[PDB]
Amino acid sequence: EFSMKSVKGLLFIIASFILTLLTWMNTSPQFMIPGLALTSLSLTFILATRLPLLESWFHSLEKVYTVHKFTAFLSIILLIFHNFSMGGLWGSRLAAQFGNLAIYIFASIILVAYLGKYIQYEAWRWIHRLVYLAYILGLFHIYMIMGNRLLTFNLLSFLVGSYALLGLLAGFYIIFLYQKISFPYLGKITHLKRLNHDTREIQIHLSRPFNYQSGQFAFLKIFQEGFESAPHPFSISGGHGQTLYFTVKTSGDHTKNIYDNLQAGSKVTLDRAYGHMIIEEGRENQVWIAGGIGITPFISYIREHPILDKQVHFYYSFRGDENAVYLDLLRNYAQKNPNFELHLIDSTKDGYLNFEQKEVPEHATVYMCGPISMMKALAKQIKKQNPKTELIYEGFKFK
Numbered sequence: 001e002f003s004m005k006s007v008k009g010l011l012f013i014i015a016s017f018i019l020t021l022l023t024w025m026n027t028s029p030q031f032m033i034p035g036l037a038l039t040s041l042s043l044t045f046i047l048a049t050r051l052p053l054l055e056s057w058f059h060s061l062e063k064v065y066t067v068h069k070f071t072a073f074l075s076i077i078l079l080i081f082h083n084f085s086m087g088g089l090w091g092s093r094l095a096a097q098f099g100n101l102a103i104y105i106f107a108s109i110i111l112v113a114y115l116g117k118y119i120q121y122e123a124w125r126w127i128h129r130l131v132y133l134a135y136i137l138g139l140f141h142i143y144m145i146m147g148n149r150l151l152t153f154n155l156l157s158f159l160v161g162s163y164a165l166l167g168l169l170a171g172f173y174i175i176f177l178y179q180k181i182s183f184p185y186l187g188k189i190t191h192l193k194r195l196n197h198d199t200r201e202i203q204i205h206l207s208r209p210f211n212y213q214s215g216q217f218a219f220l221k222i223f224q225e226g227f228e229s230a231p232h233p234f235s236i237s238g239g240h241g242q243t244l245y246f247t248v249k250t251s252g253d254h255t256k257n258i259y260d261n262l263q264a265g266s267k268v269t270l271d272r273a274y275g276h277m278i279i280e281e282g283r284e285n286q287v288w289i290a291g292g293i294g295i296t297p298f299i300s301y302i303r304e305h306p307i308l309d310k311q312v313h314f315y316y317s318f319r320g321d322e323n324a325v326y327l328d329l330l331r332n333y334a335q336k337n338p339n340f341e342l343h344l345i346d347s348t349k350d351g352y353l354n355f356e357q358k359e360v361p362e363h364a365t366v367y368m369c370g371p372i373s374m375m376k377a378l379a380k381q382i383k384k385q386n387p388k389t390e391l392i393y394e395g396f397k398f399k
């Protein structure tokens with residue numbers, strides 16, 4: 001759910017709508033519903049830019065994309081009502097036909113957005129990018145319909161133009177510029193290690209020092225013959241300065257390609273560090289819960305803090321001993337650090353993680369990284385036991 005950590009972002013949405021409505025209600029009341037939709041559309045594009053301000057305002061990128069989907073639905077509902085109240089299925093003049101085409105493209109794209117199971121991610125993104133064409137068609141419709149009412153020196157013109165320009169710039173940046181100018185960390189793959197039958201560790205030497213905090217992730221672009229160059233999110237699993245570690249589990253065609261065919265010496269690009277699961281900023285007492293590859297952020301901390309400064313109970317749940325990674329590293333860390341408690345749960349034979357019996361520290365922060373299904377029950381049990389325990393969770397998807 002949403003909390004005060006996102007309130008600023010929420011305020012930015014709410015102030016966006018009221019200021020829009022009060023504007024239209026003052027100039028063209030008959031156009032509150034379309035105009036609001038326009039503002040909403042703009043916000044949708046602004047919510048896709050992955051800018052650090054967005055993460056600061058909405059806490060996490062997952063909440064950013066949740067609000068992005070909400071603005072999309074609000075836009076489409078308002079646009080459908082506007083079409084019903086002010087037209088039919090095809091316009092009589094070019095200005096109305098632009099709106100017809102724009103609304104058809106918007107509806108089709110929103111319908112296809114919930115077709116990700118049947119569509120590869122890159123094809124999904126390429127289909128999704130038609131929102132820019134729909135937005136341009138809608139802007140053309142709006143401006144040829146309104147004429148000089150939106151080209152004068154008044155509040156309505158400034159508001160409409162400002163939101164339209166912000167949406168246009170956000171869409172252009174995310175579609176055409178983000179992968180070309182916003183990936184300034186150029187690196188070379190120097191070492192690869194296969195941890196088990198389906199997980200590979202990648203070591204990257206960068207041209208510049210990379211600043212991150214343990215528990216954060218980054219978008220990686222790989223440049224190799226036979227590899228896709230689309231950015232994929234991976235948690236940083238160690239390294240400092242000009243060295244980075246990423247631990248990739250096989251979960252699809254691209255990650256299987258990484259496990260099988262990735263070569264040392266290939267080019268990689270990284271943009272920046274994302275994430276709200278900063279372990280070093282938590283309480284003194286901490287409980288770590290990792291499911292499978294969700295161990296990747298905590299490992300980073302272990303690799304960057306040889307002497308543990310917190311009281312940590314780590315629960316690592318894996319589906320069989322063949323699916324476990326970094327067991328020797330975790331055992332060495334537990335032996336070296338008396339304040340580190342290690343609980344290895346083989347879910348095939350030991351059952352599952354149950355917190356109805358295990359104790360929790362009083363003033364404790366609980367970090368969760370793993371499947372949402374098994375994290376939800378654990379969070380419910382922990383909240384039932386100690387309702388004031390701080391809880392942070394990070395998932396491995398956006399849609």
Ligand SMILES: Cc1cc2nc3c(=O)[nH]c(=O)nc-3n(C[C@H](O)[C@H](O)[C@H](O)COP(=O)(O)OP(=O)(O)OC[C@H]3O[C@@H](n4cnc5c(N)ncnc54)[C@H](O)[C@@H]3O)c2cc1C
Pocket residue numbers: 116121217230231232233234235236247248249250251252253254255256293296297395396397398399
């Ligand atoms: C914040 C975050 C941190 C992550 N950290 C790790 C990590 O440390 N180790 C690890 O092994 N995996 C991690 N992942 C998951 C990793 O991003 C996916 O496994 C990978 O991108 C899927 O590639 P694929 O083509 O092999 O999978 P596919 O078979 O194409 O898809 C499988 C799943 O991955 C999603 N997916 C596919 N391509 C992308 C993409 N370009 N961007 C986003 N999602 C995509 C799909 O929506 C689907 O849910 C993380 C994901 C997120 C969001």
Ligand code: HEM
Pocket residue numbers: 041044045048065068069071072073075106110113114125128129131132171174175398399
């Ligand atoms: C009017 C409606 C919408 C507009 C204008 C819009 C706009 C955009 C744009 C321009 C991008 C950038 C794509 C790129 O990287 O090239 C994007 C990404 C994204 N959109 Fe939308 N979108 C809309 C609706 C939706 C819906 C309905 C969903 C989910 C059901 C959604 C989820 C996402 C996600 C998850 C991403 C990021 C995917 C990734 O980069 O991995 N959006 N959106």
Ligand code: HEM
Pocket residue numbers: 031034035037038079082083086087088089090091092093096097099100101102103106134138139141142145146
């Ligand atoms: C400030 C914003 C907007 C204003 C002032 C506005 C104004 C109008 C007007 C005056 C009409 C009547 C046209 C006619 O009767 O021929 C109309 C129709 C229409 N508009 Fe908009 N519009 C706005 C935004 C949008 C957007 C963003 C879209 C689509 C993305 C859209 C889609 C449509 C559609 C589909 C019609 C139906 C036309 C028809 O079939 O006759 N409108 N709008």
